[PDB]
Symmetry: C4
C-alpha cells in the first residue's frame, strides 16, 4: 500500500539512538567500502542505509564526481561491505525513497556540464532529466519525501558560490509528472533535507553562497511553494558566527560555504541540528527553539548533545518513519549524522524522535587513524 | 500468533548439545567480531545468537561500557561476522526476546550516571526509561521472557557491591505498561536469567554483593512477586566455597562478586548450571538437585559434564523453546555458556533439555592463543 | 506467469547507465572472483549478472576451456565474490535466461572434441546435447531469448576460422523440443546476442572467419529462419576497417577474428554497438543508423559515447526487460559491456534504452594495474 | 507435502555434471572452511552441500573425532565459508535428509565409548540415541532416505576391523519410531549410501573388515530387511584386487580397510561408482554392469570417466532428486565425489543420471599445493 503521508509529526522532546555502524573500526581489518554522503530511508518493512562509494575499500590503494561512484544500500546499522551491499545506481549525487510499494532511486552521473539524473523505480530505469544549466546538476544526498504514492525531491543546477537554479519534482512510480522552477532570487539551496508533514513537504537546505542560516522551501502536491530562511538566532550552518540576533533573509556573516543539514518545523518552533563548532565539522547537537522558525532571538529551551566537540561530525539529514511502518498515529522524525574520517570515508549514526526519556552523550566514530 | 507461554517446563533428565560457533578459531583468520556477553533467543521460526560487539575484529588494532558497543544478532551456530550479522541496537547492556510476532530488543547506552534503556520493537524505537538511581542501569544480558503477547525483564540500578534497586517490567509491543520496584532488602540481583513457566516468570540472578548462592524472583503477569535464594548446598555462583549446608538467604562465604548464571525450578527441585572451579570461571556442569530449591542439604542426583575444568567457561544463561516452535506440549528448557578467551572475546555453546539419553563431555573453545 | 514476448521493442533515442560493478577495483583488496564473459539476464523480479569463473580470486596464484570453469550469478551491480555468488552450472561456454517461471541455464563442458551442453531448469538437469561436429561446441555467452514459455538459443560447432555448423534450439522447461541446422554457406556465426521482438527472435553474432560486419539470423517459434549480414557501412566488429561503403555479404577486409557484439533492429534501421578502436578492444559507442540494416551507406544519425577510446572494452551483448518486469507496453532493449583487464579478468557496465534525455561519457574499469 | 518416494529409479545411461565448488582453489586466498566428509541432500526447493568442519579455515594454523567438529550446509556448488554456511549440528559423524516438510539432521558427538546421535528436526532437538556397543557410534556420512514422511538411516557400533553391530532406524518428524538390529554375521557395514526406490530403501555400504566388494542391505518401511554383497566381479571398494570372478559374499583379497561408496541397483543390474586406482583413492569411474548385482562375472557394458587416475578422489555417496523437485515421474539417481587434498580438506563434484548424451572427462580439484 502507498504511504499516505497525511499525518503530522508528533511532537518530540528528545532523540534516542537508533543505529551505529562503526564502519571505519571494522574496516581496519575487514573488507569495508570507503563511503561518503550516507543517508537512511525506510521502507514499510525496514530502514536501509544508502551510501555513495568510490568503488574502493578501506586500507586499499584505490582509496569527487568520478564515473566509478555508485549508490549502494545495506540494512541500517550494518557495515557497508562488498559482500552485503545491494547495488542501487551509478551516481555521484543521489536520493532514494520508498513510496510504500517500491524503492525509488535517483542517481546523477555524467560530466559536470552534461550531468543527467537517472530515476530508477524497482531497479528499472523509468525517467531521466538532463542538466538544464550545465553546471553540476545535484540533488538532496538524503531521502526524498513521499506523500500518497508520489515522491518529491529538490535539485540544484548552477554555481555553488552564487545564484543558481532550483527545481521541485513530483515523481510517481519513477516517472516525473510535474516540475516547477523555484523563483528564489538571492537564495541558495543545496542538499535539501525533505520530510512529509500533513500531506505537505518541508525541505531545509544549505546556503553555500551567503547564508549562515538555513533556507527552507515548503510545497504541497501541486508544487505550490513558499520559501524563506529559518529566522532563529541559533544559526544552523557550518561555518557560522556566534549565536546573536538572527535574521531570515540570508545571514552573510560566515555565510560562504556550508554543510548539509536539516531542521524539523513544529508550528512556529523548530528542532535544529547543527555542529557544535562554529568553524569546523566537529560535534553535533539537537536544539529546540520554541519560536525559532519565525522569531529572530537566540533563545532556546532544550539542547541535547549528540557528538562531542572534540570528535569529527559532518553531513546530517532528516528521515522519517511513516505510520505504515510504526503503527503509530503520526510521522516520527529521525535524523542521521555522518562522522567523516580521514582515503576519506565516514561512519553514520542515527537518532529518532521520542516523547520519552533521553540522554545526551557522544557516539563518535572512534577509529584510531 | 503471540506465544501463549502457559504450558509448564516438561521435565528433562539430561542436556543435549545444540550449537557451537567456534568463533575464535575461525577468527584467527576470518573477519569475526570480538564479542562478549552472548545469549540466544528463539523466534517461532528460528533461534538467534545475540551478542555485544566493541566494533572490532579478532586480530585487529581496535581489539567496558563504551559508546561504540552495539547489540547484533546472527543465526544460531554461525560465526559473528560483519558480513552476516544483523544490527539490533546500540547497547553495552542488552536483552532481546520474541513475543511470537516481532523481536523486542532492549538496549542500554549512555553515561554511567545517565544511562537510558532503549526499547525497540520490530526495529522501531517504542519506549525508553532513564536510570533512576544514576548508578549504571543494567539488564539481563540474556533473553527476556514472554507470556501471552507480553514480555518481562528485570533491570538493576545502583552499586554492584552493596544494596541496589531492582525493577520488574511488563512490555507489550515494545511499550512499558507496568513497572514494580522490588522490595528486597539485603538482596542483590544482577544479570537475571528469566524463563516463562505456566503463565509465570521465574528469574535466577547473580548476587555480586554477599551471596555465593543464587537469588531468585518469580512473578505473574501483574508483577506480583516473591523473592528468595536457592537453598541448595550446591552453590551456583563463582566464586563460591565448597559444597556444604546451604541457606535460603545469601551465603556470605565467597559471596563477593559472582558470575551470570541460571537455574531451572522443577517444583521443589532445581537444575543448577555452574562452573566446575570454585574460584575461577573454568569448566561447567549441570546438576539436578531433587530438593535444592527449598532444602539446605548438599545432596544431588544427576551431574552432567559440559565444559572440562581445564577449559575456560564464563557467563551462562537460560533460554526456552516454546510449543509454537517445537510443536510439543511443553516449554523446552535450554541454556548457553560463554567460553571467554583472552583482546577479550568469547565463543558460545548451547544445550537443550531432553528426556532421552545424553552424555557428558567437554566442548571448549579450542583456539590457540 | 510465462513471459509473453509478443510486444515489440519500443524505439529509444539514447542509453542510460544501469549498473557498474567495479569488480577489479574492489578485488585489489577484497575476495573477488577472476571472471570472464559476463552477461546479464533479467527475471520478472530482478536482473542478475552471470559470469564464468576459473575458480580463482583476484591477487591469487590460481589466477581457456578448463574443467574448473563454472557459471555463477550475482545480483546486478554487485561484485562477483565467493560469499555472494550463486552457483549455476559447470561451463566454459554458457547461456542463461528466465522464461517467467524459472531460470534456464545452459552449460557446455567436456573436451574440445567431446563437449556436451548441459541444460538446467530450476537447477535441475533436464536435457543434454553432445557436440555433433566434435570441434568445440559453443553458445551465446549472453542471455537466451524467451517467447511464450519457450526459450531459444544458437550454438556453433566447428572451426573458428572457417566454415562451421550452426543450430537453432527451442527449449521449453529445460527440454529441447525442436532443433534446426542453419543452411548458411559462406557465413560464420559465433557468440550470438539474441533478443525477442514481436513473438520472433533476432540474433546478431560474430563472424570470426571473414567478416568485419555482423551476421544475423532471425527466426520464429517454429525455427523458420532468415539469415544475412548487417548492410551498414558502419562496421560492427573488431577488428574492422574504416567506415566506407559497406555490404551485407561478409566484408573480408579485416574480417578475420572478431569480438562478441550485438545490434538492435528497428525496421530498416539498426542500433549498433561497437568498439571505438578499429584494431583493438578499446572504447565503446552506440550508433543509430536509420537505414543500416538494409542500406550500404556509412551515414548515421546518433552517436553516443559509452567507453572512451583510451580505456579497455571487450565483449558486449544484448539483454531485454520484458513488460512483466517493467509494467510497460513494450520490450526495453538493454546491453552490457565487458571491460577486460590484465590474471585476466573483466568488470561489467550495463545500459538500457530510454526515449528521454541521455549523455555520453566514459565509465571505465578504473583499476590501477 | 511429504515426499512420497514410491516411484522407481528411471533408468539412466550416463551421468551429467551437476556442481563443482572449487573450494580449495578459492580458499588459497578466501576464507574457506577446511571440510571433510561432504555430502549433498535435496529439498523440494533446492539441493544443499552438507559438510563437517574442524572449525578452521584454509591457510590457517588451526588447520579425527574432535569436540569442535560441526555439521554445516551451503547451497550446492557454493564455497564452504563462514560467511555463507548455515549451522546444522555438532557432529563428527552425520547424516541429513529432507522429508518434504523440514530438514532432518542427525549428528553424532561425544567420546568414542559414549557417543550419542543427536536428531534435529527443523533445527529442534527431537530425539537422541546413545551408543549401544560403546565403540564409536557412526552413521552414513551421506543423505538419509525418506519415504512417505518417514526417513531411514543405518548406524554402526563396534570395531572397524572386525565384527560390529548394525542398526536400521525409522525416523518420523525427527523421532525414532522403530529400530531393528541387523543379524549379519561375517558382514561389515560402514558409511552406507541409502536411496529410496519404490517405497523401499536400498543401502550400499563399505566393508572395512574383509571385503573388497560392497555389502548391501535393503528394507521396507517396516524394517524387514535382506542383506548381501554385490556379486559383480567389478569390485567397488578401495583397496581392491584386479577385476576377476566376484562373489556374493565378502571377497577377502585386499578386503581390509575401504572407502565410502555407493551403487544403484537396477533389477539384476547395477551402476557401480569406484576409484580408478585399485590401491589408492585416485580417479573415479561410473560402471554399468547389466548383471552385476547377482552375477559373478567381471563383464560390464558402459564405463564413464569421472576423475582421471592421476588426480585425487575420495569418499563418494548417492543422493536422489524426488519427483516433487523435478516434476518427473521417477526418482533421478545422483552422486557426489569428494576430492581430498592435503591441513586436510576436500572439494566436491556432483553428477546426476540422465538418459541423454554424456561425456567422460576429468573434473579434479585443481589446487596447487
Ligand atoms: C568543500 C567545498 C566544496 C563543497 O561544498 N563540496 C560539497 C561536499 C562537501 O563535502 O562539502 C561534498 C560533495 N561531494 C559535493 N557534491 C558534489 C556533487 O560535488 C558538495 O558540493 C556541492 C554542494 C555544496 C556543490 C557542487
Ligand atoms: C570484573 C569486572 C566487574 C564486573 O563484575 N563486571 C561484570 C562483567 C563481568 O565479566 O563480570 C561483565 C559486564 N561487562 C559488566 N556489565 C557492565 C554493564 O559493566 C558486569 O558488571 C555488572 C554486573 C556485576 C555491574 C556493573
Ligand atoms: C583470441 C583467442 C581465440 C578466440 O577468439 N577466443 C574467443 C574469446 C575471446 O576472448 O576472443 C573468448 C572465449 N574464451 C573463446 N571461447 C571458447 C569457447 O574458447 C572465444 O573463442 C570462440 C569464439 C571465437 C571460438 C572457440
Ligand atoms: C584411515 C583412518 C581410519 C578410517 O578408516 N577412517 C575413516 C575415514 C577415512 O577417511 O577413511 C574418515 C572418517 N573420519 C572416519 N570416521 C570416524 C567416525 O572416525 C572413518 O572411520 C570409520 C569408518 C571406517 C570407522 C571409525
Ligand atoms: C490519511 O489517509 C488515510 C487513507 O489514505 C485515511 O484513512 C486517514 O484517516 C488519513 N489520516 C488523517 C490523519 O487524516
Ligand atoms: C494455553 O493457551 C492456549 C491459547 O492461547 C490454549 O489453547 C491452551 O489450551 C493453553 N494451554 C494450557 C496447557 O493450558
Ligand atoms: C501478448 O499476449 C498477451 C497474453 O499472453 C495478450 O494479453 C496481449 O494483448 C498480447 N500483446 C500484444 C501486443 O499483442
Ligand atoms: C505415489 O503416491 C502418490 C500419493 O502420495 C500417488 O498419487 C501416486 O500415484 C503414487 N505413485 C506411484 C508410481 O505409485
Ligand atoms: Ca553557509
Ligand atoms: Ca556472588
Ligand atoms: Ca570479424
Ligand atoms: Ca574393503
Amino acid at each position: 500500500v502507498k504511504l499516505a503521508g497525511n499525518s503530522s509529526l508528533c511532537p518530540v522532546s528528545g532523540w534516542a539512538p537508533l543505529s551505529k555502524d562503526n564502519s571505519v573500526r571494522i574496516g581496519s581489518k575487514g573488507d569495508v567500502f570507503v563511503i561518503r554522503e550516507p543517508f537512511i530511508s525506510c521502507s514499510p518493512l525496514e530502514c536501509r542505509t544508502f551510501f555513495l562509494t568510490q568503488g574502493a575499500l578501506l586500507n586499499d590503494k584505490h582509496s569527487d564526481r568520478s564515473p566509478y561512484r555508485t549508490l549502494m544500500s545495506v540494512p541500517i546499522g550494518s557495515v557497508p561491505s562488498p559482500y552485503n551491499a545491494r547495488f542501487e545506481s551509478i551516481a555521484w549525487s543521489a536520493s532514494a525513497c520508498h513510496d510504500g510499494i517500491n524503492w525509488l532511486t535517483i542517481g546523477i552521473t555524467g560530466p559536470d556540464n552534461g550531468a543527467v539524473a537517472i530515476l530508477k523505480y524497482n531497479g528499472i530505469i523509468t525517467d531521466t532529466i538532463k542538466s538544464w544549466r550545465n553546471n553540476i546538476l545535484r540533488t538532496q544526498e538524503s531521502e526524498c519525501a513521499c506523500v500518497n504514492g508520489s515522491c518529491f525531491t529538490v535539485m540544484t543546477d548552477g554555481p555553488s558560490n552564487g545564484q543558481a537554479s532550483y527545481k521541485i519534482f513530483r515523481i510517481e512510480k519513477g516517472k516525473i509528472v510535474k516540475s516547477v522552477e523555484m523563483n528564489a532570487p538571492n537564495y541558495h539551496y543545496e542538499e535539501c533535507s525533505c520530510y512529509p508533514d500533513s500531506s505537505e513537504i518541508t525541505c531545509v537546505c544549505r546556503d553555500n553562497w551567503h547564508g549562515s542560516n538555513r533556507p527552507w522551501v515548503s510545497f504541497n502536491q501541486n508544487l505550490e511553494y513558499q520559501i524563506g530562511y529559518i529566522c532563529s538566532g541559533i544559526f544552523g550552518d557550518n561555518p557560522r558566527p556566534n549565536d546573536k540576533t538572527g535574521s531570515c533573509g540570508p545571514v552573510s556573516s560566515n555565510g560562504a560555504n556550508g554543510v548539509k543539514g536539516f531542521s524539523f518545523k513544529y508550528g512556529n518552533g523548530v528542532w535544529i541540528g547543527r555542529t557544535k563548532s562554529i568553524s569546523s565539522r566537529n560535534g553535533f547537537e539537537m536544539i529546540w527553539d520554541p519560536n525559532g522558525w519565525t522569531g529572530t532571538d537566540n533563545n532556546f529551551s532544550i539542547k541535547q548533545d549528540i557528538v562531542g566537540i572534540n570528535e569529527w561530525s559532518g553531513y546530517s539529514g532528516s528521515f522519517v518513519m511513516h505510520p505504515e511502518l510504526t503503527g503509530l498515529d503520526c510521522i516520527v522524525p529521525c535524523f542521521w549524522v555522518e562522522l567523516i574520517r580521514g582515503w576519506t570515508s565516514g561512519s553514520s549514526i542515527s537518532f529518532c524522535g521520542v516523547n520519552s526519556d533521553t540522554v545526551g552523550w557522544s557516539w563518535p566514530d572512534g577509529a584510531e587513524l
